[PDB]
Amino acid sequence: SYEGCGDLTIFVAVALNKVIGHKNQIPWPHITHDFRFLRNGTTYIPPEVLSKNPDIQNVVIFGRKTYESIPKASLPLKNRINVILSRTVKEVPGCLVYEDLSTAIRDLRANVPHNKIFILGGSFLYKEVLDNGLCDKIYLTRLNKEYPGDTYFPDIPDTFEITAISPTFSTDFVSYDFVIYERKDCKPPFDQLLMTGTDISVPKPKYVACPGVRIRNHEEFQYLDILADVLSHGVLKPNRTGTDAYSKFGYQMRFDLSRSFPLLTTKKVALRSIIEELLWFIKGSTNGNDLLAKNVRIWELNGRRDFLDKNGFTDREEHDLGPIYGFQWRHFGAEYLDMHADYTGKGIDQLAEIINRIKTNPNDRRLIVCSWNVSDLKKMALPPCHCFFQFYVSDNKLSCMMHQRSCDLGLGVPFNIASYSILTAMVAQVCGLGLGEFVHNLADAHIYVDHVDAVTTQIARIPHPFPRLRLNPDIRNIEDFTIDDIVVEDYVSHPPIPMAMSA
Amino acid sequence: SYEGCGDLTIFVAVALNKVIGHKNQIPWPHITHDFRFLRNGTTYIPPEVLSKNPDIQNVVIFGRKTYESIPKASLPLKNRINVILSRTVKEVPGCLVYEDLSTAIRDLRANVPHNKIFILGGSFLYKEVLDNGLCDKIYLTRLNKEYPGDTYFPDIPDTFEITAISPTFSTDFVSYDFVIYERKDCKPPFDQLLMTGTDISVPKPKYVACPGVRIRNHEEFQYLDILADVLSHGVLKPNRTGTDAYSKFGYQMRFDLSRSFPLLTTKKVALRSIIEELLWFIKGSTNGNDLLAKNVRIWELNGRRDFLDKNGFTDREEHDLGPIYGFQWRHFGAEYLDMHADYTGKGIDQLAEIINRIKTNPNDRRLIVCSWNVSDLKKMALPPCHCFFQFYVSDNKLSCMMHQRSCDLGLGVPFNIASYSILTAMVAQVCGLGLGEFVHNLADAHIYVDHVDAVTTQIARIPHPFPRLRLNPDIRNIEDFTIDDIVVEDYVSHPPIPMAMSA
Ligand SMILES: NC(=O)c1ccc[n+]([C@@H]2O[C@H](COP(=O)([O-])OP(=O)(O)OC[C@H]3O[C@@H](n4cnc5c(N)ncnc54)[C@H](OP(=O)(O)O)[C@@H]3O)[C@@H](O)[C@H]2O)c1
Ligand SMILES: NC(=O)c1ccc[n+]([C@@H]2O[C@H](COP(=O)([O-])OP(=O)(O)OC[C@H]3O[C@@H](n4cnc5c(N)ncnc54)[C@H](OP(=O)(O)O)[C@@H]3O)[C@@H](O)[C@H]2O)c1
Ligand SMILES: Nc1nc(=O)c2c(CCc3ccc(C(=O)N[C@@H](CCC(=O)O)C(=O)O)cc3)c[nH]c2[nH]1
Ligand SMILES: Nc1nc(=O)c2c(CCc3ccc(C(=O)N[C@@H](CCC(=O)O)C(=O)O)cc3)c[nH]c2[nH]1
Ligand SMILES: Nc1nc(=O)c2c(CCc3ccc(C(=O)N[C@@H](CCC(=O)O)C(=O)O)cc3)c[nH]c2[nH]1
Ligand SMILES: Nc1nc(=O)c2c(CCc3ccc(C(=O)N[C@@H](CCC(=O)O)C(=O)O)cc3)c[nH]c2[nH]1
Ligand SMILES: O=c1ccn([C@H]2C[C@H](O)[C@@H](COP(=O)(O)O)O2)c(=O)[nH]1
Ligand SMILES: O=c1ccn([C@H]2C[C@H](O)[C@@H](COP(=O)(O)O)O2)c(=O)[nH]1
């Protein structure tokens, strides 16, 4: 029945609730970037094929209803053979018309010189294509938001897997990315091996994040790869906590903050806790009760009585963490008494200083906030892990680099990535700047023994498109941001993964 | 004469003075790594070819004398067809013998089933092969030392170019790498382009280091690639000095210090100046005269009367640079008076504390020397560029990571790379540790406009194998190293490239 009708390639854009159409129209506001991706995907002809037949084109196939879903401004689709399937219309300007798919494909491959056939919907057509195994490859644009609709993309069969994932992009109404699914059952020159000067037979690593994904452009892969690399090649070392960890040294990640917000999607990350922690840093607090009071418990264990006493801090009030981040950001050099003291106008307000300098002298090469106050180290419950960051301006875009001396990959690193991304966005906004990159340096990167099963599970999870960040555009000063001013939209994630903190 | 005798592939190992042989023996102590490279290169059969004939072997061709040059025990060379050329010997146990090359190649390619033919010398044979254009590819082990000898490798014709370079390796007696030359005249799927989500036709970068080199495993490539990247994509910005610079933010380089010493070879680097400056940091000096007195002038322009005056240091004695590196390394938190004050027992001796912590608690995750003393910045003639570094120990190897806020890629970066490599080796030695990696994080990395021609010239230069470092093993304390205790052996470099410093 469908003899000769296979290897049909689908292009579709699909909302989170699988909706693809609403009142015969696209359900979301137009994403022209998606239109260009579709155009580029469906027009491509390999160089070899094109030099032999230079007039050769691909085919696009639609139901009639989808065909009207398109303007005249862009119709019939330029440089491709347009084909419409329909039992009620006989003729359409610019197109070939067939009564059914099996006739169409047969006629096409027998009688119409073309390169590749693409399937552009709608549901009727997609459903026929998938129920009958006629598709070997899907180009799918994933939108991280639900839209009202009445037309849906069918579930993709378990016979398919994701093999490519673009970077996450965003408009101001949705975050999205592009992926490729391929049917599983049809999905290294020697000099390269020799010229390493090392073993020509190098056994593949023990741990590989998402082995089936061959094009790995989602920024989350940086974090997943590092996890895989420390599990594969990390050395188990004792450490101060008394819970051992597999450790490796030296990594650099970067995130394009103009495109998306790098809140990990491979587990549900406690965003509320990250935001309260940052606002806590900004206002200069070193009182752990300020976080507890807001139902954030991430700093509880390093301020507990037994932890303080274990480390010689026998005169320290519980949850007085000492002159850590908040104190150094706002009062570097001031004498730390305790977490209740008035430090107003005492020490150096690095945070204020550097924001003002970004405004007045963007090309300054010393835009640094440093929490590694060597004189204060002995007073600290836990010396800063993210101990140093530096801003940078070019082309009216702010970037930030942070140095992290000690990186708990399971627990803290995901917090750190998201925290500095927000800080950069805040700083960019109060300075009237666009968004560049967050560059994250890992020095001692490790995975605690009791997180191994957690992270093994995690790195097998396919990333969702990252979410996007919106700050209240009215906030003019970094000290004014409240939690309601900091909104992460379109966060799609896998389930939370419990991991215990080693104090 | 030589019809059907082309595409013969050479393997040779060559001393810096082109010597390959001495008294019919190898002129250097044996490098078993080189033998292993040779054996792997000459025994490889492509998997496709091997399945069709699972007994197929390659050919190795020698002169009589070169055969006589290998132990009778290691011979005939295993898993290959051994061929000897000779006019004075007719039969050799388990080898083929020919009277001349042309006959040999013809007989072999017509009558002896085999995969690929290799040429293993000596000079008579290499010369005949090169003089007659019979070679399309050369596997060449470069040694950075001259050896006595009486047999030489001919000059390689300018019809060849280097297309592959291994990482630099070393024994205790020589620095070396592997390279491939290929004859010039005969030397990515669309999904990869589409799945970036950006412009599918990418204008190739304007600058590329060593475009001819396809396998780029020499660590110097990190530095050359970064030069090429900043030239290509960096933004022209003004800065403190009044000479503009192309600038790009965020890189990470690493150097395996157990293998070689990363003193750049694409220009002759002023190593003596690097050592004196480091010894100057170590002893804690902030007096620029201490450097001038050793005929090192790198800090002179930043301590000069006019520079001090124009930065408001009108009361500062000339070449009193203020509480910069030496002071922070040894006395962080002491009150800086001037460069003549006695600071003995004042402030925190970070350098001493970290070296002692490496000895007593190698798994500590706070092994940091921080020169970004925020309290002292306003006193400094030039706030530290390499402002923060951190050590790490695993598998009995010391690694180091440095954060450089501002990176004069033309002048200072080459100094910083070698400086921290020496410092790491020194610290490793006094703590009885082996050598791991130096990891170099660059924040604002830039190229001054007046260095563009210089660096454009530099990035087309093919790197030599890096040199190696030897410290005097008697030195037990970091303060005891003197210039004569720190020896760089086997430094081979292209000419110096003049570059002017912007103050
Ligand atoms: N977001 C996306 O990626 C995407 C992609 C495509 C479409 N859409 C949206 O989806 C909607 C259109 O889809 P839809 O499911 O409502 O309609 P559709 O599938 O485009 O068209 C339905 C009609 O096409 C004809 N047809 C389809 N398969 C046929 C076959 N095998 N043989 C004969 N005729 C066939 C029949 O028309 P007759 O009445 O002539 O028999 C059928 O009633 C629009 O809202 C559009 O914007 C979205
Ligand atoms: N480091 C390296 O990569 C390397 C590589 C190879 C060799 N080597 C060194 O080089 C030295 C040996 O080389 P070498 O140049 O002295 O000698 P060689 O070229 O190995 O052999 C000399 C003899 O080979 C014969 N021969 C070469 N080409 C011939 C041709 N076309 N037709 C007939 N006979 C031919 C002659 O034969 P008869 O005299 O027998 O008639 C000649 O006297 C040794 O010291 C060895 O260790 C070093
Ligand atoms: N990924 C994806 N997104 C979609 O919206 C979609 C559709 C919806 C129908 C549709 C088809 C073409 C264009 C259309 O206008 N196409 C123009 C693009 C305009 C341009 O960028 O120049 C074209 O030339 O293809 C607009 C809408 C089917 N398959 C799709 N797949
Ligand atoms: N060993 C160690 N690792 C660290 O990263 C760390 C920190 C960084 C802050 C931190 C601490 C705990 C959690 C954390 O527990 N997060 C959990 C729960 C989050 C929540 O429910 O709010 C998580 O699953 O992400 C997340 C972040 C302080 N002390 C630490 N000590
Ligand atoms: N790069 C290079 N280095 C050289 O020394 C060399 C030579 C010198 C002659 C020569 C040939 C083979 C071996 C020899 O013993 N080969 C053994 C090595 C055994 C092993 O290490 O396992 C082999 O099996 O090839 C040792 C010396 C020719 N071409 C060369 N090219
Ligand atoms: N703009 C700027 N860039 C810097 O890197 C820097 C420094 C770092 C130290 C430094 C200064 C000059 C040279 C240097 O001049 N090197 C020359 C000559 C070396 C010699 O012969 O001693 C070189 O060609 O490498 C190399 C290193 C202080 N102030 C600076 N200001
Ligand atoms: O913001 C933070 C703070 C701490 N840590 C981690 C690193 C270590 O796992 C632990 C601190 O222990 P030390 O490195 O100080 O020993 O907490 C983070 O990952 N991010
Ligand atoms: O060890 C050093 C010291 C300085 N610089 C460079 C960076 C800048 O080009 C210049 C210092 O100027 P500012 O970044 O402070 O403006 O010196 C280095 O590259 N390495």
Residue numbers in the entry:
A (entry chain B), B (entry chain A): 4 to 190, 196 to 511
Sentences from the paper on this structure:
Pemetrexed and raltitrexed are folate analogs designed as antitumour agents and currently approved for use in some countries for treatment of cancer. Depending on the source organism, raltitrexed has a twofold to 50-fold higher activity against TS versus DHFR, while pemetrexed tends to inhibit both enzymes equally well. The two complex structures of BbDHFR-TS have two ligands bound to each subunit of each protomer in the asymmetric unit. When both protomers from each BbDHFR-TS homodimer are compared, the complexed states reveal very similar modes of binding for both drugs to the TS subunit. The pteroyl-like groups of pemetrexed and raltitrexed are parallel to the uracil ring of dUMP when bound, mimicking the pteridine ring of the native cofactor mTHF. Although the ϕ angle of the C-terminal Ala511 in one protomer of the raltitrexed complex is rotated by approximately 30° relative to the other, this has no effect on the virtually identical binding modes of raltitrexed in both TS subunits in a single crystal structure. Both drug molecules are also observed in the DHFR subunit but appear to bind this substrate pocket with different geometries. The bound conformation of pemetrexed is virtually identical in both DHFR protomers but differs slightly from that of raltitrexed, which itself has two different binding modes for its glutamate tail. However, the para-substitution pattern of benzamide in pemetrexed allows the formation of a salt bridge between the α-COOH of its glutamate tail and the Arg83 side chain. Moreover, the glutamate tail of raltitrexed is shifted between protomers of DHFR in the same crystal, with both making hydrogen bonds to Arg42 but only one contacting the N∊ atom of His33. These interactions are not seen for pemetrexed, in which the glutamate group is in essentially the same conformation in both DHFR protomers, despite the differences in side-chain rotamers observed for the nearby Arg39 and Arg42. The antifolate drugs pemetrexed and raltitrexed are capable of binding to the DHFR and TS subunits of BbDHFR-TS, indicating a degree of affinity for both drugs to both folate-binding sites.
In this work, we describe the structural features of dihydrofolate reductase-thymidylate synthase from B. bovis (BbDHFR-TS), the causative agent of babesiosis in cattle. BbDHFR-TS is a homodimer that exhibits the classical dimeric interface seen in other structures of ThyA thymidylate synthase and bifunctional DHFR-TS enzymes. This 511-residue, 58.2 kDa bifunctional enzyme consists of a di­hydrofolate reductase (DHFR) subunit at the N-terminus and a thymidylate synthase (TS) subunit at the C-terminus connected by a linker. BbDHFR-TS is an obligate dimer, with two arginine side chains (Arg373′ and Arg374′) from a flexible loop in one protomer making contact with the terminal phosphate of the substrate dUMP in the opposite protomer.
